[PDB]
Amino acid sequence: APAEVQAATLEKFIQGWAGWGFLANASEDCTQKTLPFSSGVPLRTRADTEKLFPVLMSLMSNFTLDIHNVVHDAPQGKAVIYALTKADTPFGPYRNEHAIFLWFNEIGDRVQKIEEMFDAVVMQEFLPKLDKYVADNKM
Amino acid sequence: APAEVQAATLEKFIQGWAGWGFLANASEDCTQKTLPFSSGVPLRTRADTEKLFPVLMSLMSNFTLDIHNVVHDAPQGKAVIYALTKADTPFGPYRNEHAIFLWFNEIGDRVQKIEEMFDAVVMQEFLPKLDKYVADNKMQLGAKFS
């Protein structure tokens, strides 16, 4: 895939994340992996992502994305982003950082695969709160 | 820097890491940052790294590196490695995973800056054991693991 069509996909993925979109630029068979592998989280399908994202958006306001580093390997059709996010939530201020590994599809115009390492120390505080929120409200 | 020069430095960095000989591929002014920024770890100078690394090596036997993903952006002089590691230590078995961001120098023959996120949950047990180790043995490195 041409470096410039990949770069377009990369830019639209970032703009979609900052807009709070994300999934317009992902192919239909895209998967998301939570790193590290030791965390033992199964891949998320596209269908999974479309259910989780409304819950997140519904809980996070003033969502802000700060891009720290973008590394693009056009010959391999791969990229990495390091980003920092913040938002307001009913559980308090939310802060996270992401090293997101991206693979583009054959043509270069879609994200085919995602692997993402989060701020694990923040997540072990935040993520069970979300699961509690869903259980208490029975979704 | 030419892509070929950068790629050579990259493979040498990996080889020297897996060989557990490693600082030879780092510039004299190289820094290492532990990510996330939220963890509040000050940057490590090359001198810090030269004191910490022998200590690490000496507590880590049968070290094993598995390269999961290499991403090389030659136009920007940058690369990223996702890797998993294994070792035996007197504190028990060691397991870690690393998203390591690299910047090459101008010529391309050296790594100039390192930013590294790792298995933060597993390491908040392990790295304080190392710092207690150094304290208990009065090794006074002027540097900490966490």
A68-73: long-range contacts (C-beta < 8 A, 24 or more apart)? A69/B78, A69/B101, A69/B115, A70/A10, A70/A14, A71/B71, A71/B73, A71/B76, A71/B78, A71/B79, A71/B80, A71/B101, A72/A3, A72/A6, A72/A7, A72/A10, A72/B71, A72/B73, A72/B75, A72/B76, A73/B71, A73/B72, A73/B73
**Does residue B55 belong to any structural domain of this protein?**
yes
Number of domains, chain B: 1
SS (H, E, C) A32-67: EEEECHHHCCCCECHHHHHHHHHHHHHHCEEEEEEE
B chain contacts of residue A97, beta-carbon cutoff 8 Å: 35-38, 117
User: Is B91 part of any domain?
Assistant: yes
Contact B62/A at CB under 8 A: no
Domain that holds residue B63: 3-136
Give the angle A124-A128-A129 at the CA atoms, nearest 5°: 115
Asked if A82 has any chain B CB less than 8 Å from its own CB, the reply is: yes
Evaluate whether residue B95 is within a structural domain.
yes
Establish if A93 touches chain B: CB-CB under 8 angstroms.
Answer: no
Let me know if residue B141 belongs to a domain.
no
Residue B144 lies in a domain: no
Domain for residue B145, yes or no?
no
How many residue pairs bridge chain A and chain B with CB atoms within 8 Å of each other? 81
Residue B97 lies in a domain: yes
* Assigned domain for B142 exists: no
A76 chain-B contacts, CB cut-off 8 A:
71-72
Q: How far apart are CA A99 and CA B48, in angstroms?
A: 25
Q: Identify the residue among B34, B80, B97 best suited for mutation to test binding to A, counting A beta carbons within 10 A and taking the highest.
A: B80
Which CATH number belongs to the domain containing residue B7 in this structure?
3.10.450.50
Task: Considering only the beta carbons, identify the residue of B73, B84, B101 that sits closest to A72.
Answer: B73
Burial profile B35-56: b = 16 or more Cβ within 10 angstroms, e = fewer: bbbebebeebeeebbebbeebb
Question: In A, which residues are within 8 Å of B39 by CB distance?
Answer: 121
Q: What is the resolution of this structure in A?
A: 2.0
Contacts of B69 in chain A (CB under 8 A): 78, 101, 115
List, in sequence order, every residue forming a beta bridge with A65; answer none if it has no partner. Answer: A85
Indicate which technique resolved this structure: X-ray
Q: Give the full edge-to-edge strand order of the sheet including A111-118.
A: A26-35, A111-118, A92-104, A78-89, A61-73
Which residue blocks in chain B are alpha helix, DSSP H? 3-18, 46-59, 120-136
Q: Are A117 and A98 in contact (CB under 8 A)?
A: yes
Asked if residue B103 lies in contact with residue B113, where contact means CB atoms within 8 angstroms, the answer is yes
Helix, strand or coil, per DSSP, at residue B73? strand
Decide if B79 touches A, using CB distance below 8 A: yes
